[PDB]
């Protein structure tokens, strides 16, 4: 059960106050422009992006130059969430699905109200998280090197910029302490298991993103329960029901554990009772592309967890967002499963 063909990709949520740079960070990693396409420049839905470990290794190379950091995960599913205050339901849903998280804090503003909301969500579930202390390019006089590691860029800054960085860092540390979190600049953290690491980033220049990606792998590998590194019983959650061209009424699903297969008999909650149907198409986006954006879909015979998938199947009208989804196995009674899922 701990075999290479049984590794699980964990789930990381991004959380943070409105406009702190959650989507912009993911756009820099993906090399996409989702944020520019958003109405109002604000995220209004949960979005999912799968990052294969190959891509993570490449995007952390500048802080792993000798190639010796050991990557154990096969990849990571990252769930983007709204910061706008009206979407607390979606932050709660995203937080409930993740195994680890990134909390984005604008270094220029510190902790803000939806930061405090997000901290309550993280606290409640004992979720391991790192803080992306974002927007460092706004420190006055910041000199960038695109996609550099933070420490190498920080060493090239003038004294005023270094002073300003430390002043803002010390303020944010105090704010975290007021909320009951002891936090450390990531390379000053001597207790990774119990203290929150602060990793300075810019989504505009890419600086510090290599450090942030390395740290979330370290969260998976060193803080997340080790059992969650491997696949066990299926767990899946409906995010949305949506009509799309050619496929009809589909569901978007976060596959949290186990394996889904084309043709599977699935059961889930509907407005009038359980829905029982068969997967006609099991779809994902391309790697490093979003689920919440229309694009061309990849069809799979099999999808291993975690992933964001789109399922086409008859009868999904009235599927309920937040519903669990189960697969009828050989030893299952299809009617008995209907009752379990609700
Ligand atoms: N200068 C600078 N601007 C940034 C950075 N990150 C994000 N921004 C800007 O901040 C604004 C908000 O960015 P978003 O990516 O929408 O932030 P978000 O946290 O995803 O916002 P919501 O999802 O709406 O809560 C945009 O204008 C970004 O270009 C950064 O590192 N530096
Ligand atoms: Mg966003
Ligand atoms: Na925004």
């Amino acid at each position: 059960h701990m075999n290479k063909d049984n590794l699980r990709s964990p789930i990381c949520c991004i959380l943070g106050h409105v406009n702190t740079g959650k989507t912009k960070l993911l756009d820099k990693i993906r090399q996409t422009n989702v944020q520019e396409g958003e109405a109002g420049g604000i995220t209004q839905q949960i979005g999912a992006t799968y990052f294969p470990v190959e891509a993570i290794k490449q995007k952390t190379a500048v802080v792993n130059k000798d190639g010796k950091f050991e990557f154990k995960v096969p990849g990571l599913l990252i769930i983007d969430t709204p910061g706008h205050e009206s979407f607390s339901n979606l932050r709660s849903r995203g937080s409930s699905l993740c195994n680890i998280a990134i909390l984005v804090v604008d270094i220029m503003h510190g902790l803000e109200p939806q930061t405090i909301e997000s901290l309550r969500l993280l606290r409640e579930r004992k979720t391991p998280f790192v803080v992306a202390l974002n927007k460092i390019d706004r420190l006055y006089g910041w000199k960038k090197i695109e996609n550099n590691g933070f420490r190498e860029s920080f060493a090239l800054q003038n004294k005023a910029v270094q002073n300003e960085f430390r002043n803002r860092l010390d303020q944010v540390k105090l704010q975290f302490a007021e909320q009951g979190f002891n936090s450390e600049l990531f390379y000053e953290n001597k207790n990774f298991a119990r203290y929150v690491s602060l990793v300075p980033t810019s989504a505009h220049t890419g600086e510090g993103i290599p450090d942030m990606l390395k740290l979330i792998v370290q969260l998976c590998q060193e803080r997340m329960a080790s059992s969650l590194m491997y696949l066990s019983e299926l767990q899946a959650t409906v995010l949305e029901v949506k009509a799309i061209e050619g496929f009809g009424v589909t569901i978007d699903v976060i596959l949290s554990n186990g394996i889904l297969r084309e043709g599977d008999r699935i059961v889930l909650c509907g407005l009038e009772g359980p829905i029982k149907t068969n997967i006609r198409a099991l779809l994902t986006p391309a790697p490093m592309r979003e689920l919440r954006i229309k694009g061309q879909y990849i069809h799979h015979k099999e999808v291993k967890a975690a992933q964001g998938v789109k399922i086409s199947a008859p009868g999904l009208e009235g599927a309920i967002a937040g519903s669990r989804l189960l697969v009828v196995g050989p030893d299952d009674d299809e009617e008995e499963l209907e009752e379990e899922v609700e």
Side-chain angles (χ1 to χ4, degrees), residues 2-341:
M2 317 320 189
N3 151 78
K4 292 157 220 81
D5 278 309
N6 206 43
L7 294 170
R8 173 177 175 278
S9 296
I11 303 167
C12 182
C13 194
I14 320 299
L15 294 162
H17 189 82
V18 71
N19 287 331
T20 49
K22 303 178 288 292
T23 303
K24 205 75 178 175
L25 284 165
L26 295 176
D27 275 336
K28 189 66 167 170
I29 297 163
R30 295 186 292 245
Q31 303 183 337
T32 53
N33 296 282
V34 175
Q35 195 276 339
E36 287 93 344
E38 284 176 336
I42 55 163
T43 300
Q44 299 181 235
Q45 293 189 94
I46 290 177
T49 303
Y50 186 77
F51 295 89
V53 69
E54 171 184 42
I56 300 172
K57 292 176 57 185
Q58 292 185 355
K59 290 171 187 301
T60 55
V62 298
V63 294
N64 176 36
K65 292 184 194 183
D66 60 14
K68 290 195 210 145
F69 179 75
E70 189 182 352
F71 294 83
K72 291 173 203 303
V73 298
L76 184 67
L77 184 65
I78 294 188
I79 295 312
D80 191 9
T81 59
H84 187 278
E85 63 161 70
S86 298
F87 296 88
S88 63
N89 70 315
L90 296 186
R91 288 182 290 278
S92 178
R93 179 169 295 143
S95 161
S96 74
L97 289 164
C98 77
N99 308 127
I100 62 154
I102 297 167
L103 178 66
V104 184
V105 170
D106 179 345
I107 197 174
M108 305 304 287
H109 295 356
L111 273 36
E112 310 177 85
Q114 268 59 61
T115 322
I116 305 306
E117 181 194 320
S118 296
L119 281 167
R120 291 200 291 280
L121 294 170
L122 294 166
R123 198 186 278 116
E124 269 167 13
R125 303 192 70 245
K126 304 186 168 121
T127 303
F129 68 96
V130 65
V131 174
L133 186 59
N134 198 39
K135 312 208 187 175
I136 63 185
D137 60 284
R138 295 204 66 237
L139 298 166
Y140 183 72
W142 181 267
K143 297 184 309 261
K144 74 162 186 89
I145 293 168
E146 206 84 1
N147 299 311
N148 222 17
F150 172 75
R151 294 187 79 176
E152 276 180 26
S153 277
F154 190 62
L156 299 167
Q157 305 305 313
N158 69 43
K159 186 62 180 184
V161 166
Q162 292 181 330
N163 282 345
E164 186 185 354
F165 170 76
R166 197 66 197 200
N167 288 155
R168 294 189 185 278
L169 174 73
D170 285 345
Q171 293 181 48
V172 171
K173 283 170 70 172
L174 286 174
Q175 290 185 316
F176 275 112
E178 286 163 356
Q179 301 300 325
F181 292 90
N182 182 253
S183 62
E184 298 281 13
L185 179 58
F186 68 105
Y187 53 91
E188 296 178 354
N189 188 357
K190 304 298 180 171
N191 204 341
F192 192 64
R194 302 293 178 189
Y195 287 171
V196 176
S197 289
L198 308 175
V199 55
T201 60
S202 170
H204 280 195
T205 71
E207 288 164 303
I209 293 185
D211 306 273
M212 184 188 78
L213 291 171
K214 181 180 167 187
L215 277 158
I216 67 184
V217 172
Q218 287 173 229
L219 294 175
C220 290
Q221 294 179 182
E222 305 170 29
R223 286 191 64 198
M224 174 188 81
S226 54
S227 73
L228 285 167
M229 298 280 284
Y230 300 94
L231 296 165
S232 52
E233 297 89 345
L234 184 129
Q235 197 199 287
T237 300
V238 181
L239 289 186
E240 203 185 353
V241 192
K242 326 188 61 76
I244 60 165
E245 178 49 355
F247 288 106
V249 181
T250 64
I251 51 178
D252 291 349
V253 170
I254 296 300
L255 175 63
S256 292
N257 219 318
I259 306 178
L260 281 171
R261 297 170 178 98
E262 184 190 287
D264 271 348
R265 186 79 175 161
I266 56 173
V267 303
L268 63 132
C269 298
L271 196 80
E272 296 183 328
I275 294 166
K276 298 84 61 47
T277 189
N278 287 85
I279 301 184
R280 294 288 185 264
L282 178 62
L283 309 168
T284 69
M288 307 203 42
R289 292 302 172 107
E290 256 204 335
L291 184 57
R292 60 177 164 115
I293 91 162
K294 170 26 190 178
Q296 167 140 302
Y297 309 110
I298 305 184
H299 293 235
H300 304 276
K301 289 176 171 182
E302 179 178 275
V303 177
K304 299 184 154 177
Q307 251 282 43
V309 304
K310 177 181 290 291
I311 283 165
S312 174
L316 292 167
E317 289 83 4
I320 294 174
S323 177
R324 287 294 179 81
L325 176 154
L326 300 170
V327 169
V328 180
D331 284 330
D332 291 330
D333 177 298
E334 317 199 354
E335 293 191 327
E336 294 178 352
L337 265 188
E338 315 178 5
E339 288 333 330
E340 290 181 34
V341 76

